[PDB]
């Protein structure tokens, strides 16, 4: 152990002071020794960290099988790097350029050497110590093998930067579990400690300056500087993955909280990436180093996810967006709360309803990215609404403004068509194509045309004990603007008001879906639909127009899941727009109990006149009035 091999390490840092004693007076195998002690100190006194990758390993779960497999084939050398392929030999003297197989893709995830975190979790299981005798011999043995500058195409595999993040970020909980072993010598942390930083700091010098990588090599660069702040340059390290993740949550995300991308589950993805970061450094006490903006954005993040999400624990599936595990979503509200000690909201999530409060608000509009929340409560049986009025998103966005998912007692009346599938052949993109459909979702059509944008403008949005309020305007074709209110009316039901305004003529459609099992009744002589559920939580939808209106049902399907779909009832209000006067629809949404439909009637009021944004409305509800009486634009 040389003098040299200590360059690297601050010898002032809080704890280090018999080892830099040693350093200077020359017995640097004693201050090795001692720098093993301060670390071996620290694992005690601290949990390992993995809550930084896609899938945390738990200490406490017992060894499944596939783990137990990973770890004692490692013992014989035999890796699979690869999910399309099965284990290789790589021999017994470890050959690291090995190509099994005509893939790329086979050499760049051997060198996320993932089977060292396997070992870890074995080796704490159990506590056998050819476990660890193994790891440390792997460990030596890749970086003697494999130094930055070996040749130009092993640095291609092993030196890329998107693995190199990979192994910063496995590294300090495999390094944790293992540190304790007598296999692990004081020669071997130091080898150990310079070959991470040499990494670390490459990381630092080649992240990337684009996409996907950008925000997960920038994390990891950060995560290394959190969990090895030893390092001389372990603060630059936490400061640079800060300056970026800073720099792209501002650029990334809206004031309101929500992802730019429009889509619900890429926004949860969203806030992992940005609350993991600060998640890891806050058990350090080294938060202080996040701006405030930073740390109230991600909360914030949480907050809009809460506000989309339904009583089922799902969000509406928007875009490219489906339903997900409730149980896995109570451990991501669980995490966060752990970040978020003193938010109640999240505490609720985190508990199903347990522990904390209800979040603060009902019924809520997230203004920038366009997503409005009718809700009576937070409860198991609340109604819930949920709409898409946004700006423009990219591919996990599609052009449907105006749609919603209606949550009635327990039921998704109103889901979501869905993704199906991503991009592919021409087979597979019609498939595809078929789901971003306008037609499909529950907003108006010219022609059954798609909408050319997603650019709504806020027109009036204000909430209410018995009645909130959304007024946009989409601008869906050159010459067709599209006005659509939304008026939840005594938390119960839902008055939509559709206008075709412009010079474009041809056939309007407001269009409507229902879930899989409603078994509807479509009934043209009243222009009304309802479900036929045997339990009595049904719904009605009705168009009230005065003028003539036709009703027809057609094609409709719903993917909860990747590659699975289900026919499901969909029906749609159609009307002629003849010349350049606008046409209205008024529908009532209707929520019901027991198995008879009501009988609802509407008689247009003085005052009510849609063109100076006026209505003053009387439903009659099975022989009970109603007055509705609102303005439906505001500022003006
Ligand atoms: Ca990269
Ligand atoms: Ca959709």
Redesign the pocket.
């Given at each position: 152990v040389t003098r040299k091999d200590f360059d690297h390490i601050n010898l002032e840092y809080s704890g280090l002071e018999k080892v830099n004693k040693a350093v200077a007076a020359g017995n640097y195998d004693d201050a090795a020794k001692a720098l093993l002690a301060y670390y071996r100190e620290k694992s005690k006194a601290r949990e390992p960290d993995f809550s930084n990758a896609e899938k945390p390993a738990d200490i406490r779960q017992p060894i499944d099988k596939v783990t137990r497999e990973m770890a004692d084939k490692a013992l014989v050398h035999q890796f699979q790097p690869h999910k399309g392929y099965g284990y290789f030999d790589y021999g017994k003297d470890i050959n690291w350029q090995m190509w099994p197989v005509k893939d790329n893709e086979v050499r760049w995830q051997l060198h996320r050497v993932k089977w060292w975190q396997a070992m870890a979790l074995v080796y704490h299981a159990t506590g056998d110590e050819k476990y660890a005798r193994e790891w440390v011999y792997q460990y030596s043995d890749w970086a003697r093998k494999n130094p930055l500058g070996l040749s130009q195409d092993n640095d291609k595999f092993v030196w890329?930067?998107?693995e190199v993040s990979d192994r910063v970020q496995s590294l300090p909980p495999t390094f944790s579990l293992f540190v304790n072993s007598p296999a692990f010598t004081p020669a071997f942390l130091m080898e150990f400690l310079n070959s991470y930083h040499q990494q670390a700091d490459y990381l630092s010098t080649h992240?990337?300056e684009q996409g996907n990588?950008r925000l997960f090599?920038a994390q990891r660069n950060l995560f290394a500087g959190v969990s090895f702040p030893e390092f001389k340059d372990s603060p630059r390290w936490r400061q640079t993955g800060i300056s970026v993740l800073n720099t792209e949550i501002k650029k990334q995300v809206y004031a309101d909280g929500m992802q730019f991308e429009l889509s619900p589950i890429y926004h949860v993805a969203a806030i992992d990436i940005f609350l993991k970061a600060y998640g890891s450094a806050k058990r350090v006490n080294l938060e202080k180093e996040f701006p405030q903006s930073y740390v109230q954005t991600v909360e914030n993040m949480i907050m809009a996810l809460i506000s989309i999400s339904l009583p089922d624990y799902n969000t509406p599936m928007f875009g490219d967006s489906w339903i997900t595990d409730k149980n896995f979503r109570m451990a991501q509200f669980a995490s966060w709360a752990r970040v978020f000690p003193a938010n109640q909201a999240i505490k609720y999530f985190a508990t199903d309803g347990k522990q904390g409060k209800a979040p603060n608000f009902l019924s809520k509009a997230l203004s920038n990215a366009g997503f409005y929340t009718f809700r009576s409560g937070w409860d198991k049986n609340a109604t819930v609404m949920v709409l898409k009025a946004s700006p423009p998103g990219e591919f996990h966005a599609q052009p449907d403004n105006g749609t919603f998912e209606l949550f009635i007692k327990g039921r998704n009346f109103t889901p979501d068509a869905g993704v199906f599938v991503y991009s592919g052949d021409e087979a597979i993109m019609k498939l595809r194509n078929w789901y971003r459909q306008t037609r499909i979702h529950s907003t108006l059509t010219l022609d059954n045309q798609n909408m050319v944008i997603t650019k709504a403008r806020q027109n009036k949005w204000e909430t209410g004990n018995n009645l909130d309020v959304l007024t946009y305007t989409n601008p869906s074709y050159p010459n067709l603007d599209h006005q659509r209110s939304v008026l939840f009316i005594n938390k119960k039901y839902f008055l939509v008001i559709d206008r075709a305004i412009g010079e474009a003529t041809g056939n309007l459609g407001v269009h409507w879906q229902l879930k899989e099992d409603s078994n509807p009744v479509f009934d043209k002589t009243k222009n009304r639909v309802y479900t036929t559920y045997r339990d009595g939580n049904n719904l009605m939808i009705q168009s009230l127009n005065a003028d003539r209106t036709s009703l027809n049902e057609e094609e409709g399907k719903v993917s909860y899941v990747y590659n699975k779909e289900l026919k499901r009832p969909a029906f749609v209000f159609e009307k002629p727009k003849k010349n350049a006067g606008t046409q209205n629809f008024v529908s009532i949404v209707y929520p019901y109990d027991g198995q008879k439909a009501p009988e609802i009637s509407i008689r247009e009021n003085k005052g009510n006149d849609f063109e100076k944004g006026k209505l003053n409305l009387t439903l009659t509800i099975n022989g009970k009035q109603q007055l509705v009486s609102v303005p439906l634009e505001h500022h003006h």
């Open positions: 890329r930067p998107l992240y990337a990588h090599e």
